[PDB]
C-alpha cells in the first residue's frame, strides 16, 4: 500500500509504570484535545490514499496522530511523559511542514497546538 502500517501502540514486555505526568497527559491533555471541535483530522493516522496525498509518506518520516497517542497512553506504552510530548510535537510538525500555510488543516492544528502548549505549561512536576 501507499500507507505504512500504523505506529505500534502496545509494548507487551515493558513493565507497567504510572506517573502523575502520564496521568495528566491522558486525563487532561489528550482528553481536552480529543474533544475539541478541530480534533477530527488528527484522531487517526493520515490515509494518503483516501485523502489523495500520494507524496505524504515520502515527506513525512515519522507519522503521528492523536489516535495513536491515545492508545499508547491507554496501553502504558510510554516510559515517560516526555516521549508522549514528543509525539504531540511530531504530529504538529508533520502538519506544518507538509501542508501550505493558510490551509484549513494548518489553522486547525495551530488551534490544537495552542491548547496543547497551555496544558503542558501546567504539567505536574
Ligand atoms: C493531519 C492531516 C489530516 C488531513 N485530513 N484528515 C481528514 C480526516 C477525516 C476527514 C473526514 O472524516 N471528513 C468528513 C467530514 C464530514 C463528513 C464525512 C467525512 N468523511 C477528512 C480529512 C489532511 C488533509 C490534508 N492534509 C492533512 C493532514 O496533514
Q: Of 40, 27, 12, 7, nearest to 124 (Cα)? A: 27
* Length of the chain measured in residues: 125
Resolution (A): 1.1
Q: How was this structure determined?
A: X-ray
Residue with CA nearest ligand 1 atom 22 = 41
> How many Cα atoms sit within 13 Å of 115 on the Cβ side?
18
Q: Which residues, at least 6 apart from 23, have a Cβ–Cβ distance to it below 8 Å?
A: none
Q: Are 33 and 111 in contact (CB under 8 A)?
A: no
Would you call 51 exposed, middle or buried from its count of C-beta atoms within 10 A (0-12, 13-18, 19+)?
Answer: exposed
How far apart (Å, rounded) are the C-alpha atoms in residues 61 and 10? 20
Q: Are 75 and 18 in contact (CB under 8 A)?
A: no
Residue with CA nearest ligand 1 atom 28 = 95
Domains recognised in the chain with CATH numbers: 20-121 (1.20.920.10)
Per the listing, cell 506504552 goes with 77
Q: Are 77 and 9 in contact (CB under 8 A)?
A: yes
End-to-end CA distance of the chain: 43
Backbone angles phi, psi at 51, to 5 degrees: -90, -5
Report the 3 state secondary structure along the chain: CCCCCCCCCCCCCCCCCCCHHHHHHHHHHHHHHHCCCCCHHHCCCCCCCCCCCCCHHHHCCCCCCHHHHHHHHHCCCCCCHHHHHHHHHHHHHHHHHHCCCCCHHHHHHHHHHHHHHHHHCCCCC
Nearest ligand 1 atom, CA 91: 1
Q: Of 44, 39, 31, nearest to 119 (Cα)? A: 31
Amino acid at each position: 500500500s501507499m500507507n505504512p502500517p500504523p505506529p505500534e501502540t502496545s509494548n507487551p514486555n515493558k513493565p507497567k509504570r504510572q506517573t502523575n505526568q502520564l496521568q495528566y497527559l491522558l486525563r487532561v491533555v489528550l482528553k481536552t484535545l480529543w474533544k475539541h471541535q478541530f480534533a477530527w483530522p488528527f484522531q487517526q493516522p493520515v490515509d494518503a490514499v483516501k485523502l489523495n496525498l500520494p507524496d505524504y509518506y515520502k515527506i513525512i518520516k515519522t507519522p503521528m496522530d492523536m489516535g495513536t497517542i491515545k492508545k499508547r497512553l491507554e496501553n502504558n506504552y510510554y516510559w515517560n511523559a516526555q516521549e508522549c510530548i514528543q509525539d504531540f510535537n511530531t504530529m504538529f510538525t508533520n502538519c506544518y511542514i507538509y501542508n501550505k500555510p493558510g490551509d484549513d488543516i494548518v489553522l486547525m492544528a495551530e488551534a490544537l497546538e495552542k491548547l496543547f502548549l497551555q496544558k503542558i505549561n501546567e504539567l505536574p512536576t
